[model samples]
Target: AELKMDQALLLIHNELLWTNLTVYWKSECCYHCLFQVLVNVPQSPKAGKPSAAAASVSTQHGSILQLNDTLEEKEVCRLEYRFGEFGNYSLLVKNIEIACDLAVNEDPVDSNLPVSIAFLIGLAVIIVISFLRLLLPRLRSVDTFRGIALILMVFVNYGGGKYWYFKHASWNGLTVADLVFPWFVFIMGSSIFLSMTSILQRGCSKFRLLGKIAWRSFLLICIGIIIVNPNYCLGPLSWDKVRIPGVLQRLGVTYFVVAVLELLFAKPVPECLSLRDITSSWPQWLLILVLEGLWLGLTFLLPVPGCPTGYLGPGGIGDFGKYPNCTGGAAGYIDRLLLGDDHLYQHPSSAVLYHTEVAYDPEGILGTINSIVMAFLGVQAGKILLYYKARTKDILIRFTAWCCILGLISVALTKVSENEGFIPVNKNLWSLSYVTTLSSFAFFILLVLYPVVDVKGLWTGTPFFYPGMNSILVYVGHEVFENYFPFQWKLKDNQSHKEHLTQNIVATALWVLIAYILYRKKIFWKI
Candidate 1:
């Protein structure tokens, strides 16, 4: 029998667009009717009046059908039916009615079950090891958290079995993929404070430290633009169209700002401190707040001639398809005005679902401010670690406090809603709420891992620790060799999530192994 998954086939002129067909079921499992197809065709009898026809929506287990042709999108027909699993169906729109044809086909199995099972197996293994006391030896809790985020980052980057949750959220929602980068940035912040304190302690002059910081930032930006560039795959990297803003480039800029701020405010670490170390860095805190204010003011106040004042919505099918070219609002405008659309990330994550037309970069100019703010928050985490050195209870208590405060801020800003909020936690815009939310998560993870890995001696960071120790190498190597043999190859079943998941897991494992080997060999790739 031929496997016929849930699919919507629309014949538009000569082109066939297999639009939204959400398949999330096996033979026995029930499926929801969440499919919709919107086509803009010319309306009948009136050829000149902005006759861009309206939408075609099927909802509620296919019990409701809406087909409109007018500019106002007045409903022309309504349908009601209980669509069964494996049922083949066709819908036709007429003057005042809908025609339907139906058949049946084979099942392709539930796509999520295998991925869920894999997660279960991994969890079970971890639990088993912890019980048996087979966990690896000590690595700092911060590094362990960084390792966890990096490994997950590699998995998601390799497609995470093509699962939507493993990918970035289309618009204003959180996904497994969204958590990794912010966590990485947060840890980077912690590392900056810890390392800078050590370097300054070693009598390394601020001038030398400043030179090294500038050189390292330069290297990061150059590598991001030249070597790890996505355009290299297309051609010889023409200057006219090559993307300028990227992950490494953003990291570079963020690193420069935060590191410089810390350098200027470099102070002697007190062997012991009162309640919290926050008061010691009041100036740095003020600057971070000012930066956040700038981001908020520009985001909501900056006017891009055509787009709404603070339009954060993805500009295609989102917001009822009203502002088709106003993606990212002022953020998009700034990047286009300064960097040009040709230099920005052309295929934004929103394009996959919202079908946005304008190019938008997630790591754009305005978002970098928030990125710095995120890193600075991590720096505060490091300050906590140093201020209460060996006072695990104090450190954990502070971490818990920070987490709760940030989480509350996010809840207030988002109203705990995904889409409807004052400032929805959007990664593309790097909204303030997103920084607070992800930082809260980072703190919580560290809060848990600190006790288990460092204080309690109950678990080791294992494979994650290895990669965390040499993150730059693993990250750069994975990107450079992503398409090469061993990391990726042709699959027997291209449509199967099982195959893609297996490949991604194996590829991610190989990087962990490589990182482990590099750790043993003491081959750290420091940029």
Candidate 2:
């Protein structure tokens, strides 16, 4: 069930002088402390400014809070605070006298109503379109798949109208944002095989192709480091504080690994193959298994100092605040050791919800292993396509089989639960289960899209197709020109979801239109 706002909260501001006081509530059998520290010292201390305390309490019952002087070890004052459901109250303490002040909806809760409305409308449109068979030229399902991922990428990257569900999950579980990157990687895997095969068939030298792959990967990394940098403006590059790991950086590495693996294991497309075509790629599968094994061993067995060996929980206030510095566990440790804390992502998704203090990058080093695993599964899909060329039914059957197999593995690994599984599907770590679950989704998406877009020619990839065709350009352009005029503008209501949604939708739509124009003008900026 969706959680609704049904609780009351009390925020106490302490203005006690000279000594600290501990405030608590007694629940018949035990003492429940509400808060301790009330004073927050500013970085630049002022002479007479009152130090505000940051103590907040949520309660179902209005109760008395006993304030005890820490130095004297005796009860000094008793203050009663209470509120009804969804009520937020602020209590002020000045010279030991407490006053009750009811704050009138100061902090308004963000609702998912906007997102739900959008989703329902989109669903209705899709359903309505499905009923009307409109004849369109057959578009490759692969392009449409890439389009789907790219569109979602743009949407989520643009804040997805600031909806929590559209954002990446703090620690474990999945979100709409989580689904896009892995799908993008999966399609990248598929594209590598399809494109490379086309190039090789055109009599391109293997060595030349390998050089191209290396150069492209290098360019991607360079772009990530020098161009698409968030820390570039922080004075003279601030080399020490430059984030070493990023989305494009991971993409570059994954591309190099998967592409090189495919290059090394290059084989002629067989004219005929049985349902067990996977057997032919035994060596690649063995290597992938080894890589996954390495990820598993390091993730579960690596000894992180001051943290449990297999601690995957987001540190700080999560898991009841135990292991406060073990944000990503081994994943965080390795990144800090290799890249240094200054060179990592200072603000992670976990920081927002999990109260994590550590610099944990979602696109960190350790997670790339599972990234490779993810792309490799896509490679397998591409291989299936080639192995059963023109045999649509055969291709779909294999896609379905892979989908079911991966899905079953995910069910076992996660036990069909979000956070209670053996290895929760965490995108931050890119855990084995995460990759498997995403791969299953990738296969299923392809299964549906292949027939709908390609086999029956019911729908053209349309606006999505335009952006997908120029994905690298669109992605880089969207990020680079994100804050420019027309893409973004001053809104009348900055906090309104409707306004944010409008802005984001307009920005994404403009990119698609720009892509369409560029496509017509034959201006593809291929890396």
Candidate with maximal TM-score: 1
lDDT of each: 0.77, 0.77
**Could you give candidate 1's per-residue lDDT for residues 213-322 as a string of tens digits?**
99999999998988776746666757888889999999999999999999999898987337548988999999999998999999999888988998888887677667
Q: Judged by lDDT against the true structure, how good is candidate 2? A: 0.77
Model 2 misplaced regions, further than 4 Å? 1-110, 119-139, 232-234, 272-276
Q: If scored against the real structure, what TM-score would every candidate get?
A: 0.85, 0.80
Per residue, candidate 2 scores C-alpha lDDT tens digits across 1-527 of: 11123244555555555645566643211112123333332221332444444444433234566766667777756666554434456655555253323354455343456667777887898877766655422237887788778888888888788766778887778888899999989989988988888888888999999999999999999898877767443567767768878988989999999999989988777773385458877888999999989999999999999999988888876765667788899999999999899888898987855567878888999999999999999889988888786788898899898999999999999998777899989988898899999999999988898878877887778757888888899888888887788988998866567778878877877887898999899887878
The backbone clash count of each candidate, in order, is 0, 1
TM-score for candidate 1, please give it: 0.85
